[PDB]
Amino acid sequence: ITNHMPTAELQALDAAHHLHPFSANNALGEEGTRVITRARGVWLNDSEGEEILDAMAGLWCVNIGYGRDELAEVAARQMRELPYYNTFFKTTHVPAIALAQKLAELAPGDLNHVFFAGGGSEANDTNIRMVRTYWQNKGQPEKTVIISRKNAYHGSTVASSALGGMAGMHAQSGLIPDVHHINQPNWWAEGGDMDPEEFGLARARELEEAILELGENRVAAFIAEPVQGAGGVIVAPDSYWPEIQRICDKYDILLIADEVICGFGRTGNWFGTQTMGIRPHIMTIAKGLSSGYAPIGGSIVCDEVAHVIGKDEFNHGYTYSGHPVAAAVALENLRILEEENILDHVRNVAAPYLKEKWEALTDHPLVGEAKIVGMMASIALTPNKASRAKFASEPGTIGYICRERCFANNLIMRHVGDRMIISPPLVITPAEIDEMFVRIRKSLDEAQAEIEKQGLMKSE
Amino acid sequence: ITNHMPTAELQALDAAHHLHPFSANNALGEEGTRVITRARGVWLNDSEGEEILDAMAGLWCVNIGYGRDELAEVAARQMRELPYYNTFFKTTHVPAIALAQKLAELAPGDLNHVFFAGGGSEANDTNIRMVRTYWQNKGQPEKTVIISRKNAYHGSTVASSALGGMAGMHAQSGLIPDVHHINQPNWWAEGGDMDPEEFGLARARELEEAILELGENRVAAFIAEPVQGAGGVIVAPDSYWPEIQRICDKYDILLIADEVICGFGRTGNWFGTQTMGIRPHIMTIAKGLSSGYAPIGGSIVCDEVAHVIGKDEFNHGYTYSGHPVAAAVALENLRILEEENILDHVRNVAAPYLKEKWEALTDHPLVGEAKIVGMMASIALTPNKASRAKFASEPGTIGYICRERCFANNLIMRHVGDRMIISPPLVITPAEIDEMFVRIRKSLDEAQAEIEKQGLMKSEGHHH
Numbered sequence: 036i037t038n039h040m041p042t043a044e045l046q047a048l049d050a051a052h053h054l055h056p057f058s059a060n061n062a063l064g065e066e067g068t069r070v071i072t073r074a075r076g077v078w079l080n081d082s083e084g085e086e087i088l089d090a091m092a093g094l095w096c097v098n099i100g101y102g103r104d105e106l107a108e109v110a111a112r113q114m115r116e117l118p119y120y121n122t123f124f125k126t127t128h129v130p131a132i133a134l135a136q137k138l139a140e141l142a143p144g145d146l147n148h149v150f151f152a153g154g155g156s157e158a159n160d161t162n163i164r165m166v167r168t169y170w171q172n173k174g175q176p177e178k179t180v181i182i183s184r185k186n187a188y189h190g191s192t193v194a195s196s197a198l199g200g201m202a203g204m205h206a207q208s209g210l211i212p213d214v215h216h217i218n219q220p221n222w223w224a225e226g227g228d229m230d231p232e233e234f235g236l237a238r239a240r241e242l243e244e245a246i247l248e249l250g251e252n253r254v255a256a257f258i259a260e261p262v263q264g265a266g267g268v269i270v271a272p273d274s275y276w277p278e279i280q281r282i283c284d285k286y287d288i289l290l291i292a293d294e295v296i297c298g299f300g301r302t303g304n305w306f307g308t309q310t311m312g313i314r315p316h317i318m319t320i321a322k323g324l325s326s327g328y329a330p331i332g333g334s335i336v337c338d339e340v341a342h343v344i345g346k347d348e349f350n351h352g353y354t355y356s357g358h359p360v361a362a363a364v365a366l367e368n369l370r371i372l373e374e375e376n377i378l379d380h381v382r383n384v385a386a387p388y389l390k391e392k393w394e395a396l397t398d399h400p401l402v403g404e405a406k407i408v409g410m411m412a413s414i415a416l417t418p419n420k421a422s423r424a425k426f427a428s429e430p431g432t433i434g435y436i437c438r439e440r441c442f443a444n445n446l447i448m449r450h451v452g453d454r455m456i457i458s459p460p461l462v463i464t465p466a467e468i469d470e471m472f473v474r475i476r477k478s479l480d481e482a483q484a485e486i487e488k489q490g491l492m493k494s495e
Numbered sequence: 496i497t498n499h500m501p502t503a504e505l506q507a508l509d510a511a512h513h514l515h516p517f518s519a520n521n522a523l524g525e526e527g528t529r530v531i532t533r534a535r536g537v538w539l540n541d542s543e544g545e546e547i548l549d550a551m552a553g554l555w556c557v558n559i560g561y562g563r564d565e566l567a568e569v570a571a572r573q574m575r576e577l578p579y580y581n582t583f584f585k586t587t588h589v590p591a592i593a594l595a596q597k598l599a600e601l602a603p604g605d606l607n608h609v610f611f612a613g614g615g616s617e618a619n620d621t622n623i624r625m626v627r628t629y630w631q632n633k634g635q636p637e638k639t640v641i642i643s644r645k646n647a648y649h650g651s652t653v654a655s656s657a658l659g660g661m662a663g664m665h666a667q668s669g670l671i672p673d674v675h676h677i678n679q680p681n682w683w684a685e686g687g688d689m690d691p692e693e694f695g696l697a698r699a700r701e702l703e704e705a706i707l708e709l710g711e712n713r714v715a716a717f718i719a720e721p722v723q724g725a726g727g728v729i730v731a732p733d734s735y736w737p738e739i740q741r742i743c744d745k746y747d748i749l750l751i752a753d754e755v756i757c758g759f760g761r762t763g764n765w766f767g768t769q770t771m772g773i774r775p776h777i778m779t780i781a782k783g784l785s786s787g788y789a790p791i792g793g794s795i796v797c798d799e800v801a802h803v804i805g806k807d808e809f810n811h812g813y814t815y816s817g818h819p820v821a822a823a824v825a826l827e828n829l830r831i832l833e834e835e836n837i838l839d840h841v842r843n844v845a846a847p848y849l850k851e852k853w854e855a856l857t858d859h860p861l862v863g864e865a866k867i868v869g870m871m872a873s874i875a876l877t878p879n880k881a882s883r884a885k886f887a888s889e890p891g892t893i894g895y896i897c898r899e900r901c902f903a904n905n906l907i908m909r910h911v912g913d914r915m916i917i918s919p920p921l922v923i924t925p926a927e928i929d930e931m932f933v934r935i936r937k938s939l940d941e942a943q944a945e946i947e948k949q950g951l952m953k954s955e956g957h958h959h
């Protein structure tokens with residue numbers, strides 16, 4: 036079993052033993068998976084030798100791009116010295132110390148302390164436990180309710196599924212008590228005839244209304260992604276975040292900013308919370324933290340919350356919390372992002388160039404809107420732009436059609452319902468972006484022809 | 496910031512920024528954490544130059560021991576070639592395929608399918624969601640309750656905490672609805688006047704009682720570690736597991752064997768499941784999977800459960816599910832365990848030697864019982880073995896004193912209540928085992944003296 040085995044045999048072995056995330060696995064197995072074998076820069080190769088443009092950066096995470104062999108070098112060296120030790124036994128190691136200090140340095144405000152975990156789901160479980168423990172330690176054991184949003188995504192543990200706003204996840208043991216969901220600020224889909232800025236305000240004010248309905252004395256936290264990622268890159272109207280922040284200042288609740296996707300340069304700053312000018316008590320991190328080179332996530336925590344949690348035993352943590360190889364890899368990732376000025380590249384070169392071409396996609400007959408913040412973008416596909424119509428088919432039928440075209444054209448672009456999404460490596464160049472657009476326009480053209488032929492150009 | 500920066504300075508930076516698991520972090524920060532800088536074989540070094548015998552194998556996980564540079568080479572090679580790709584987009588990579596195939600091969604019976612996760616806690620979240628979805632898919636959405644046990648440990652997410660049986664965890668948003676806990680088969684502490692085999696039967700029959708109290712139609716699954724690890728290495732009487740298995744056959748519920756600790760040679764087999772002769776529908780894996788050299792976990796799932804789950808979208812999984820570097824490292828770990836015959840080393844050499852010396856610990860005045868399965872072991876500390884007495888002090892008071900003596904004597908042996916536990920690397924030699932026991936006996940003698948100094952050598956009911 037090597038990259039030398041014929042593709043059909045690899046697929047057969049995968050189908051026989053490997054259960055894939057977010058899949059209908061029996062059908063997946065008979066259809067056969069695409070086998071990815073190497074990557075460099077923004078490009079992948081599969082087992083057949085296709086050259087594929089990865090406009091999704093792995094899974095919103097390979098921020099410095101592929102082929103950064105400095106990280107392999109750092110990983111091997113750490114693995115030889117100390118490949119594992121725990122942080123449970125009044126013990127630590129130097130990679131955990133250095134990474135936590137670097138994260139404290141990069142995080143805004145007084146976000147100065149780090150609880151490590153394996154990834155974003157595990158870190159949001161830390162957050163749930165930590166905010167509720169925080170309020171107990173403050174003498175307010177009644178404050179337990181966590182407010183989140185419809186169409187949010189916060190991970191895939193039972194409790195993290197519960198925070199997210201995905202009905203299909205809730206229905207598969209994705210619920211826990213004392214989570215409440217307000218509306219998402221998706222103007223395109225839900226704004227009606229409201230002005231986008233008035234819509235932003237009304238959607239934000241739902242937080243205050245929820246707090247008063249539940250009782251401030253019962254509310255522990257509000258959690259939100261700065262830009263909704265897995266929900267389809269939903270960019271809130273500009274009025275939304277300042278109104279949320281005002282509400283959070285007024286009431287005695289913790290603000291958690293989920294930075295799992297937005298983190299580490301994705302929105303054109305170190306954190307989406309800097310882009311949106313918000314002041315969270317906790318930030319959830321993973322993905323770009325290590326550019327996906329090693330599994331690691333965590334919670335960056337303000338002074339007050341860390342002090343209060345520190346006053347007694349906090350009966351929480353994971354074997355791999357602070358893993359020294361993963362921590363060394365993450366530190367090397369951050370060193371590249373910082374020392375090679377990747378954020379300047381994003382802000383001055385890649386983000387402006389992408390924006391101009393991305394937003395120009397509304398000239399395509401299928402494209403009703405084109406939204407982008409920094410290096411995450413979406414387009415809404417519609418059969419009638421005049422009424423911002425949804426398709427009459429199940430959401431995702433059209434998105435799936437376009438997605439299959441992108442993959443057949445050697446482009447990784449994902450769908451979320453009938454929105455198409457990108458999230459390229461931060462290091463992508465104007466030249467690479469041009470080629471991305473050649474493949475996007477070809478896929479959109481071919482998708483539209485398929486949609487028209489199959490009689491699917493129908494409004495709901 | 497390097498292994499060369501002085502200890503006090505490293506400690507100050509750790510206190511400034513690093514929140515630790517399962518700790519009182521403010522007090523920890525003022526004490527100063529211990530900084531581990533390197534590890535070779537079964538030995539750690541700290542930043543003061545102390546050499547420490549790691550009788551806990553990191554955290555029940557460094558099964559091939561430290562210093563196996565083959566995994567570093569395999570890791571670096573994978574990272575240069577393909578450091579990450581997702582398994583979400585109808586895509587896969589060779590490390591995931593090779594590892595899933597290898598796990599299927601080592602797993603018993605028809606446990607042939609693997610769902611990857613980041614570690615044990617995430618993998619038990621997979622299991623909760625999978626067993627519940629399974630019953631929904633069969634048109635029985637009432638089957639939601641998972642039965643587990645007091646003093647179980649199944650991870651530290653909200654829901655896998657709920658499955659664990661630790662009150663301190665549950666109190667800190669660590670409990671969810673539809674989890675029911677039956678009693679644990681700790682004969683030493685809880686057996687009363689019962690014979691151990693009668694106690695084992697009665698402890699197992701609580702599963703049947705709970706199923707009938709809840710209604711079989713409401714029960715999705717029972718989950719258990721073959722040997723309770725974090726709970727104090729609690730080895731059930733011989734009668735216990737055959738009776739749990741009979742009950743799990745009798746009633747229509749799924750059986751989850753949590754193999755997070757017991758897996759990968761720890762009980763002297765590939766799985767605690769083999770050792771105890773049980774037939775689970777799902778096994779949880781992590782820790783020993785990669786000997787802790789890379790974060791990775793998962794769930795190994797029997798044919799029929801996998802098939803039913805596979806019939807529709809299973810809306811679950813993690814960014815780092817199947818991580819190709821972690822998966823390459825895990826495969827190389829399994830290669831070493833298998834091709835250097837480490838399980839033979841355990842079965843023929845280390846386990847019988849360890850058992851001999853461990854069980855002889857009961858000649859020590861503090862040591863009431865000494866229990867051991869393969870390479871996981873515990874002792875119960877007592878002021879009076881003849882009545883299996885508990886100390887007058889709250890459990891853990893005496894265990895703490897002992898643990899502090901172990902730590903000062905450069906031995907990683909931990910306490911749970913007034914039980915001391917070890918879980919050394921599988922590859923420990925009889926000679927290293929001897930040196931471990933020199934440190935164990937010294938620590939027990941100093942513990943006994945410290946207990947006497949504090950006025951704590953009294954049994955329960957006898958404070959006055």
Ligand SMILES: [Cl-]
Pocket residue numbers: 221223224415454
């Ligand atoms: Cl939309």
Ligand SMILES: [Cl-]
Pocket residue numbers: 681683684875913914
């Ligand atoms: Cl006990």
